[PDB]
Design a protein around this ligand. Sequence first.
Ligand SMILES: CCCCCCCC/C=C\CCCCCCCC(=O)OC[C@H](O)CO
Ligand SMILES: CCCCCCCC/C=C\CCCCCCCC(=O)OC[C@H](O)CO
Ligand SMILES: OC[C@H]1O[C@H](O[C@H]2[C@H](O)[C@@H](O)[C@@H](O)O[C@@H]2CO)[C@H](O)[C@@H](O)[C@@H]1O
Length: 468
Amino acid sequence: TQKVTPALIFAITVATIGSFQFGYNTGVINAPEKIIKEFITKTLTDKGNAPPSEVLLTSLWSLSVAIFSVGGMIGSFSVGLFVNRFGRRNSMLIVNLLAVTGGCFMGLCKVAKSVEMLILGRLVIGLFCGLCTGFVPMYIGEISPTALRGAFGTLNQLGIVVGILVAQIFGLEFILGSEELWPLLLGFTILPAILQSAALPFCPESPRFLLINRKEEENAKQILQRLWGTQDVSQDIQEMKDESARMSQEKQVTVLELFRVSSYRQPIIISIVLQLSQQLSGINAVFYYSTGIFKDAGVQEPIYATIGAGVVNTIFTVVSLFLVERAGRRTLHMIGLGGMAFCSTLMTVSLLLKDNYNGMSFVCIGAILVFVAFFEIGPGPIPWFIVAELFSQGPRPAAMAVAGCSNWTSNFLVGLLFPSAAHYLGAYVFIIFTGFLITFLAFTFFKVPETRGRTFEDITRAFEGQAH
Ligand SMILES: CCCCCCCC/C=C\CCCCCCCC(=O)OC[C@H](O)CO
Ligand SMILES: CCCCCCCC/C=C\CCCCCCCC(=O)OC[C@H](O)CO
Ligand SMILES: OC[C@H]1O[C@H](O[C@H]2[C@H](O)[C@@H](O)[C@@H](O)O[C@@H]2CO)[C@H](O)[C@@H](O)[C@@H]1O
């Protein structure tokens, strides 16, 4: 007997402002490219350099884009420097200083005639976003009622995709995507941060962290009673007491220790492979090629098809949210991997028959949109919250620094190496991705145990049994 209280929904929603931040900053950079390149040309040339070549502009732009990922790699790997020392909620209150700072660098670089400020600002917003992708699932995972852990955990990915969609809408030239307003398109990131710092004082630190890491039992119990809307919180205080007992019997874990301890090695392998199943799914290739295929299919301003694909992107994230607690994690993730595997084959075949049987441009659009649906059914939301469920309280931060960093790093290497691969492979690049997908589908079938509705204590014991 536990309803969902307005206070619990408020807490998790405010935390997922971090997710919206990650989505917005990831997706905001593409639309203003040419406006910002003219800005770079004007800035240099007014400081007395010769006008930059295309080569130089491509170079400086590419650095603006990419230095975000470098920040995200670092930020996410450092989550373990914050969450135990400051607590989960307080950590969020602290790193908003980074968000406001990076948003100011980006938002002010034009009136300050500074290309360096734009780049610096993209790195600092990257550090911020990396810390977010680790803080938000840890908080959500630790305060959620056990039967709603994955559902609430899906709001993370929903926050991300909505952030992306809003970044693209704002980037329209009649909104903020203009030569006069692109600083506000970029600086916009400080408003959600300002909004989250105002609201975070009304969000409790999770009763789990309070009881387990700070041994504050009777104050954890009072938080719990309000979040749940009931006063019988008995089963659940002690399960937390069981985790507290468990944690005081364990040496807690460094990143290196995850890999030497045997009880951890397969949870951490599941954790990382699931991140690769997300970033090597082919989803990147689909967005890359997407704008090109649209223009080719008679859509003379293809940003609206990109926005339309974001709408689809959002729809099927909610679909997953409603399915994840009944269907399970295994089922939703493998449905995704196989559904994608089918679509990337149809893309290779479409593109190869394209200007010989001419209708194929629409076929390839159908495949792209069906791909996005299958991505959000499982491989999108699940890798972001599952790591929190595979570990007990003590190892969780280090585990989520590793899993989070491997998500950003694989994303970075993919964005780096794919243009070459596509150049030599052409349309056959969707066939290597079909090959990854089948392999990940195999991996999930044999290696990933079901975690839906199970306590941390019963998930951990099963991993310990197997290691025995
Ligand atoms: C701004 C972003 C938001 C965009 C808004 C578009 C989202 C709506 C689209 C699809 C949702 C599917 C509808 C699901 C509603 C009913 C599901 C349900 O109630 O089933 C679960 C139930 O608990 C089992 O017993
Ligand atoms: C019908 C064909 C059979 C398909 C393959 C069936 C074998 C099991 C599959 C995956 C789990 C493999 C590992 C299971 C043990 C891992 C640790 C674990 O069980 O996790 C904790 C569990 O969640 C506590 O509820
Ligand atoms: O800019 C669009 C964005 O799309 C994909 O973003 C992924 C993201 O990487 C995943 O971590 C996850 O959260 O879902 C997003 C898809 O909605 C690309 O992977 C990303 O590089 C790209 O920028």
